[PDB]
Design a protein around this motif. Structure first.
Motif, mmCIF file in Angstrom:
data_model
loop_
_atom_site.group_PDB
_atom_site.id
_atom_site.type_symbol
_atom_site.label_atom_id
_atom_site.label_comp_id
_atom_site.label_asym_id
_atom_site.label_seq_id
_atom_site.Cartn_x
_atom_site.Cartn_y
_atom_site.Cartn_z
ATOM 1 N N UNK A 127 0.808 -1.224 0.000
ATOM 2 C CA UNK A 127 0.000 0.000 0.000
ATOM 3 C C UNK A 127 0.838 1.269 0.000
ATOM 4 N N UNK A 128 2.157 1.143 0.035
ATOM 5 C CA UNK A 128 3.028 2.296 -0.152
ATOM 6 C C UNK A 128 3.238 2.619 -1.624
ATOM 7 N N UNK A 129 2.721 1.797 -2.536
ATOM 8 C CA UNK A 129 2.743 2.196 -3.938
ATOM 9 C C UNK A 129 1.758 3.349 -4.176
ATOM 10 N N UNK A 130 2.278 4.575 -4.186
ATOM 11 C CA UNK A 130 1.468 5.758 -4.449
ATOM 12 C C UNK A 130 1.888 6.427 -5.749
ATOM 13 N N UNK A 131 2.447 5.637 -6.664
ATOM 14 C CA UNK A 131 2.929 6.143 -7.959
ATOM 15 C C UNK A 131 2.255 5.461 -9.155
ATOM 16 N N UNK A 132 1.259 4.620 -8.894
ATOM 17 C CA UNK A 132 0.682 3.783 -9.931
ATOM 18 C C UNK A 132 -0.695 4.290 -10.336
ATOM 19 N N UNK A 133 -0.691 5.333 -11.163
ATOM 20 C CA UNK A 133 -1.900 5.892 -11.741
ATOM 21 C C UNK A 133 -2.976 6.273 -10.731
ATOM 22 N N UNK A 134 -2.546 6.817 -9.603
ATOM 23 C CA UNK A 134 -3.453 7.244 -8.563
ATOM 24 C C UNK A 134 -3.895 8.666 -8.778
ATOM 25 N N UNK A 135 -4.757 9.154 -7.908
ATOM 26 C CA UNK A 135 -5.183 10.539 -8.001
ATOM 27 C C UNK A 135 -4.297 11.372 -7.102
#
Ligand SMILES: CC(=O)N[C@@H]1[C@@H](O)[C@H](O[C@@H]2O[C@H](CO[C@]3(C(=O)O)C[C@H](O)[C@@H](NC(C)=O)[C@H]([C@H](O)[C@H](O)CO)O3)[C@H](O)[C@H](O)[C@H]2O)[C@@H](CO)O[C@H]1O
Lengths: 258, 257, 257, 256, 259
Positions: free
Chosen positions: D85-93
């Motif tokens: 859940x630390x992936x905050x670079x994968x096509x998020x807002x």
């Protein structure tokens, strides 16, 4: 010097009562509320009106006369905030949280405090702003200096009068109060949610580390409280402190002293 | 020091009781307990804080009755003094919304206290190693980029007031065997202060061998930080706000070799 | 190994003390302890984080006095180092409102530490299996869509610093019999860091049979992650910020068959 | 009639496994996510698609063939892959201009159970007029009373990828032979708080010292771990779930 | 009542198991468990809430096996649980999107969770947010209200002796009474407050007081009371309704001799 506890049927007694909050009571329909809060333009010009200032509550409860020296020793406390569910009234001239929404409930800064003691609660003055002009009819730190914003040992008092000692200027003096047990929580922020627990199954033991509770001088028990639950915001956005009453049940026993 | 028996007798215990005032910066003669308003540099390289914008650690060295015996610190009662003052939401504050009360003190807090038999030992850690710390403060010298994580060169003693900025020093966990320290940092601009008060709570200072701090030269060292949050003025400028801390320490005489 | 008796006597105990520095990505010579600014991929399938944007697990292998006797790890004291540096809200930060102080480090955090008598064993889990992990990192290979939930092919040892990205790997609960591990993920973009320091708290490392990690080859393995949150700069670019972790471990000699 | 525990080398065994989440899996790339959530136009027209509905996970684990019965005594458990859940670079807002992606957050349900038979379920509906989709098992003959309690809605968690989380809870009037634990944390900005450690054990014994007794030498494990919602660039939100590790220690127990 | 020994033997214990349904107002035939949408008065004087906008206390009087020496059933333990916690994951049913293309805003805000077990009806004390509130027909409310009723007016005493009748917002357990009841409640206020609801079948509350005595059931009746207002549901248009859930109770009782 503390000696033995008396036993036998006559040796125990019980005090039961409620303390009403003293939030300011700005008019005849607004008992339990303060006046709407307004903000001064400057530090120098801070001059709150009395009905805008919540005050500590106190009751002195006479105990059965004990005039060997005996004293009533307070042993246990049960306590509760009364009317917690009243805060579910979100349909009464509140401010809608959003278009078509319910009223903003009471929230923001709270102070919940109670003490039990064998004499008046001893207070130390601390001022947010030493240049605040406190109003007539309140008892407040006098001869304030800039050092009063952190610690000025001149500001000593007794919580000896109801609706008189503003909450914001006074705290329990930790350098004194040996014959009192006090407990308090300040929860700050404008949006903090009230969290209020009730039960008749919780007891607080008032004995110190030597097994001795508050000893009631002159056969008086001193109960004190503050229960500022938060602020109510009305339809136009004005905010008022809202308080609730506190229940106390204290059990006492007779103790011999020299 | 080899630790031997505790002395008994009425003369064998003593008590210290005092308060430590906060040192938040005191930007003028009316703002004791506050810092200067906080500004923000345009870059890490240009970070150059005013002395009066930097809260510092508080310390008091308390002489004990003259005493091989040493005073041993056994218990602490402590308390933040003046918690209710934060209910003044009517003094030059920023209204939360039209017609509202002032925003109360909120945001990043650091509450810390220590009791020791010698000065608290500090380790320097910098948020930004290129920060220029101001004259009058004692700060990590010969800083490098490694100072942002750990540079063992930055050792110091908390041996002076209004001197050691809170943001660049912490208790050195590699030392301090003769001190007990406790602190909590709660970060975030809207963190609500949660301050408890009571005279019924005692902390035991004994270590796992039943030995408390031993007071070298008969001095007890008390240290504190109580940055409660920030006060926001009408215009939105923010100042750190601190409060004083009460200490009551009980001590007993202990023989040592 | 049958585990037999503890050896007593003066020679029979030892202590290890050290700090692990965080490996947040270190994007340039001035930004140790920070990651590169985080950027967002245009599509799910084109997620391709650069190496300096990926925090990694920290690990140190500590040689013990040469010794069948084995060193047994019994207690741990541990602490995040430099918690107060997060009060630097005056250095290239983003104002929380007009004239306000800088937004402090906040948001998603992961604080983790382990102590073991061999390398921490990892299991790979991927947020997005089509993520292209960068060269120079060790990541789950042969990823399939099952890797987003559980693919038991993704096993590794935390045997290298600056290599194993936090977001790809967790301790493998099916293994690690000879390690004790503890971690907390706190997610959300505004969550406030809550960081406690004290030198009075000890963790006992013994299992339910009274046995601690047994150090194979006289090596003790320490591992850590302390991503405290994200720092937001003036323009709104966000970077992970990490801090070092202190470990003090006590060990005793244990006979084994 | 529960009698004594059998001791000796042969008398204990251990089960270890992972249950994968069943969040809806809207396509071949999206295992562990739901379909993007859409909102009905009215209350009566609520009709969620199957791949939008997270469901309870269940595994039935065969035990060594054994009157003796395997008794479950302890449990270690944790969520697997919390760091993902630390992936905050994968096509998020982006949280704001130039910011990182918004992390998984919002409503969560974390639930696990260990039982010597299938978990027993009681149905409760947010909205009794919701049409639940083909391929799910949902409370039948719903009435307005189903919104608070309709005792007709009884079922067994006897099938994977089938019982929607929002319809079913453990039946507190049954489940004598199961231990269950769950927390719902609601609100769109609720931050995930997930702890992992290999040092925490839950004791499964009741007040009489008896754990779940495994009927037919089968151990039933059930879980839900909806961690929150992932928000895509365009604002669409999908439930994200994670797998759960189970380690259960069991002992042989004689019974009449 | 002088409490004496506990009776033992096969016939000396019994168990009560049930659920109390919530009483949130039920504004129409499709909205069991919901209140009417909340509207706000323009003044305190004009606060006049409709009945179906007011959550009420739930109560059940449970008959026990007849015992008429005096024996009374003594309540000893409680398991309790909120039923249907997962229903609050329905974020797809005409809610208000949290943002463009987003899911529905889940139930949230002010909650009150309360339960009590007693050997007689829960005793109530009235407290009013606003003493000039006019409570509607069909509800039982503090009468002869004065401004003092906003903090404490000892006239406002009642028994929770009827279902769908006692509005939550004007009544609390009376701490000066309730000797023969054990009560527990939590108010969590604030419009964005997230529900936190734990379920398990492994937790038991002991009902015995400091003298080892639990509620003694007068007339062989056990009284169960509950409120479980979980928060508010926000519909697409922004109108808000209270949402409640049922509560499970399992109580173990034993026979106790009294003088
Ligand atoms: C590259 C990109 O993000 N482009 C944006 C468009 O997606 C968006 O148009 C919407 O697209 C919808 C389906 O596409 C997504 C989505 O829901 O946004 C794309 C997501 O990256 C994807 N997420 C994952 C984890 O795979 C998501 C997912 O597969 C499904 O939601 C599963 O239910 O699909 C859909 O077609 C909409 O109708 C459409 O509006 C546009 C306009 O908002 O902006 C583009 O930049």
């Amino acid at each position: 010097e503390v000696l033995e506890v008396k036993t036998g049927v006559d040796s125990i007694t019980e005090v039961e009562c409620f303390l009403t909050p003293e939030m300011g009571d700005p008019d005849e329909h607004l008992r339990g509320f303060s006046k709407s809060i307004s903000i001064s333009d400057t530090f120098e010009s801070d001059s709150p009106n009395r009905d805008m200032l919540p005050c500590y509550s106190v009751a002195r409860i006479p105990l059965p006369n004990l005039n060997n020296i005996l004293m009533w020793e307070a042993v246990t406390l049960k306590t509760e905030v009364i009317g917690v569910t009243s805060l579910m009234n979100v349909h009464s001239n509140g401010q809608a949280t959003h278009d078509n929404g319910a009223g903003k409930p009471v929230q923001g800064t709270s102070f919940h405090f109670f003490s039990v003691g064998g004499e008046a609660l001893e207070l130390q003055g601390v001022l947010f702003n030493y240049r605040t002009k406190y109003p007539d009819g309140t008892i407040f730190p006098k001869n304030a200096t800039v050092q009063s914003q952190v610690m000025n040992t001149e500001h000593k008092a007794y919580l000896d009068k109801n609706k008189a000692y503003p909450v914001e200027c006074w705290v329990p003096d930790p350098t004194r109060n040996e014959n009192t047990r006090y407990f308090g929580t300040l929860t700050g922020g404008e949006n903090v949610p009230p969290v209020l627990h009730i039960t008749n199954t919780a007891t607080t033991v008032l004995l110190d580390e030597f097994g001795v509770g508050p000893l009631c001088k002159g056969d008086n028990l001193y109960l004190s409280a503050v229960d500022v639950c938060g602020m109510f915001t009305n339809r136009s956005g004005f905010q008022q402190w809202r308080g609730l009453s506190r229940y106390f049940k204290v059990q006492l026993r007779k103790r011999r002293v020299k």
